[PDB]
Design a protein around this nucleic acid. Sequence first.
DNA 1: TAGTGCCGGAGATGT
DNA 2: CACATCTCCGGCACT
Length: 104
Amino acid sequence: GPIQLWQFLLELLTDKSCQSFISWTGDGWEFKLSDPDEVARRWGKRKNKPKMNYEKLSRGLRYYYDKNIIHKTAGKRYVYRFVCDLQSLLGYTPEELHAMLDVK
DNA sequence: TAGTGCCGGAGATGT
DNA sequence: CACATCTCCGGCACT
């Protein structure tokens, strides 16, 4: 109703003009917030939260671990991975979407 | 070092 | 009373 965080990220991850601060790493559904501050800034404006930052935003993401919606890529900073059936949800395969988005 | 990423508990919050 | 954060926090690990 009032868009969820994992849905927000997907929204960005499927818009070329947002590749500057968030993007697919080419490996399946794993993505990277190259500019966490910019992601958190936009997250903040969406939900109307002037004090939103990555520290908080990431707390939202860790909530998704048990929910098996998004998982953390251990070892790579600002990198996480959608572990849920995004193929059925979006209708595309990682390859198909990457292609469509021109992911390198 | 202190700074920063990252973790997950807990009370607060409400475009 | 639910619910998805939001906010804060003590902790651990790495550089």
